[PDB]
Amino acid sequence: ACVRSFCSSLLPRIHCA
Amino acid sequence: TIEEQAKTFLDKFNHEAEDLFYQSSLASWNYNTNITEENVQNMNNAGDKWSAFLKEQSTLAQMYPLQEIQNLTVKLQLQALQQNGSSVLSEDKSKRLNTILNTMSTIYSTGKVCNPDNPQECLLLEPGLNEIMANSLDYNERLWAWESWRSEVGKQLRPLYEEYVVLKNEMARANHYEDYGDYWRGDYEVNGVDGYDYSRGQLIEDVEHTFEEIKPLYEHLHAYVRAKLMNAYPSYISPIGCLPAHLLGDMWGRFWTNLYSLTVPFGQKPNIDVTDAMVDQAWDAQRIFKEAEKFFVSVGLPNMTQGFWENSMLTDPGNVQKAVCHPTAWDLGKGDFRILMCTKVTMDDFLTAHHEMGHIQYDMAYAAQPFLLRNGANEGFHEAVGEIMSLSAATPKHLKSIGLLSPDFQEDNETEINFLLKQALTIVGTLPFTYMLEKWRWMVFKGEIPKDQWMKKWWEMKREIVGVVEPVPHDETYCDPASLFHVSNDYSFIRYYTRTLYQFQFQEALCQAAKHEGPLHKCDISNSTEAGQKLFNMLRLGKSEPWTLALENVVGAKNMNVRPLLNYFEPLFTWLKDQNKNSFVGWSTDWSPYA
Ligand SMILES: *CCC(=O)N1CN(C(=O)CC*)CN(C(=O)CC*)C1
Ligand SMILES: [Zn+2]
C-alpha cells in the first residue's frame, strides 16, 4: 500500500491507524 | 478514449486525496507532537477515512486496464492506485493481519525484560537495554540484555510472526506475487521504459554481485575489529572465529558505531566531536537548523517556508505534552512542510538536521508533480539524499568554514583514518547485517526455509555472511529477527543497502560537478550551485521517471554501483590490510563460545 508518504521515517505502526 | 477517460479520473482523484491526505498527515503530526487519547482517536478516524478512499479508488482504477493506456505518466499513476493491498483477503483475514501487525509492533514498543537471576524492576529496550548494549564492557551483562530481549519479546512474537508470514503471502499471491517477498521487491521493478526496465529478481542478483566486491573491505574490518575486541573482551574471542552477537555496540549488531572507543586507530588525535565547540558557541536548535538552511541556499536550493518555521517542532516540547522524538520530516501537502525533532545540541543531532532537511528539499522539489508522482524515485532514493548531506556537513573544511573547528588543526593522515573507520563502523558495518537479514526473509517468504529450521538457518547465516555467532544456542521457540523493529513493524529493509551505494554513487557526481580536487571523504559542496542544480534535476521529478533513468540524469548508470563506495574508504582498505597482515582475515562458522 502507501501511495504517498508523510514522514521520511518508519515510525511504529501503533503511531498509525 | 480510455486514456482521456482515465486522465479525468486522476484529476478528480488528485483533488479529493490532497484534501483527505493532508487531513490525515496532520492528525498523525498532531498526535506525535502531543500524545493524547484524543489525538489518537482523530488519527484513527483520519486514517480510517483515507484507507476507505484508497480502497474505492483502487477498485475504480482497475476499470482502466493498462494495455489501452499509451501514455507513461498515467499508467504509473494507475499502476500505483491499482496495485498495493487491494484488501484481496477476506474481512476476517484482512483484520486479523492488522491485529497481528499492531500486536507485534505493540509488544516491541511495550517490551520489558527483568533480570533472569534478579527480577525486581524489568527494563525497557529504550533507553535501558540499548544503554547497556551501547556502553557496558561487561560480557556477562551485555549477554543478559541480548538473550533476555530474544528470550521473551522474540518468543512471544514467534507464534504471531508465523501467522503473519502466512496471510502476507496469501495477499501477495492474490496480488499476483510469488510471495510477500517478491512484492517488496516491486519498488525497483521498471516495466515499459526500453533500456531502463528492471525486474523484481534483477535486484537480488545485483544485491549479491554488488555485495561481493564489498567482501574484500568487510573482512579486513572484521579482522581489525575482531583484534581490538580480543583486547577488550579478553577470554571470549577466537582469533579466526565469528564475533559474539552481543558485543557489537548495539542490540542486534546492526551498527558498529559504538566500538570506536575500542577500535580507534589513534586515541591520541582529538576526536572530531564538535559537540563541545557548539556548547561553547552556545548554538541553539534554531541555529542548528538555520545553519542547515544556509547550506542548501549555497548549493542553489530555496530557504525553508515560513510555515516550516511556524509549524515545525525542533525542540523537546516539554513534560506538559508527551511527544515521540524520532527525528522526522513531514509532507502534508498544501505547501505545508515541517520537521519534528527533539534537538539536543550535539554533533550527531547537528548532522541529523541536515538529513531531515534533505527530505524537505526533496519533498519540495517534486511538489509540482501530481499526487501519485509526489514520491522518491524508489524506497532508497530519499535516505541517500539525506545521507549525502551529512557526508559534507562533517567534512572538517565544513566544520572549519562553519567555525565549529578552528582554522588550525590541519588534517593529518592519522585523523583521516580515524574518520574513515568511524565511518566504516557504521556505513560498511550494516550492509552485511542488512543483506543477511533481508535475504533470510526473502527465503522465508519463498517457502525455502521450514519453520522447524528457521532459527537454524538464521544464525547459520549470520555466521556465513556476517561473521557473527550466537553467544547462546537458540531453538525454535525463539524469533530473533522479530526482536528487531523493521521486522515486527512489517518494513522492507533492503532500502538501507541500496541507499548506501546511491549516496556515494551520488556524491562523487556532485563533487565532480563541484570540481572537488582531493578524496571524496573531504568534499563539502557547501557553495556548489552547479551541483545543487544537478540534484534538483533528479529531485524535482519525484517518481515521475523510473529510478534507472533518474540515476542516469546525475551519475551515468541505470543500476547501483559499488566502486564509488570502494573509492571512498579506499585509504582505509589499504591501511586495514597492512594492519591485518599478521592477523587472520576471514572467519570460521564452526566456532562457538558456548561449544
Ligand atoms: C503511506 C504510508 C506511509 O507513510 N508509510 C507507511 N508507514 C506507516 O504505516 C506509518 C503509520 C511507515 N511510514 C512512515 O513514513 C511513518 C510515518 C511510511
Ligand atoms: Zn469516495
Ligand SMILES: [Zn+2]
Ligand atoms: Zn532519513
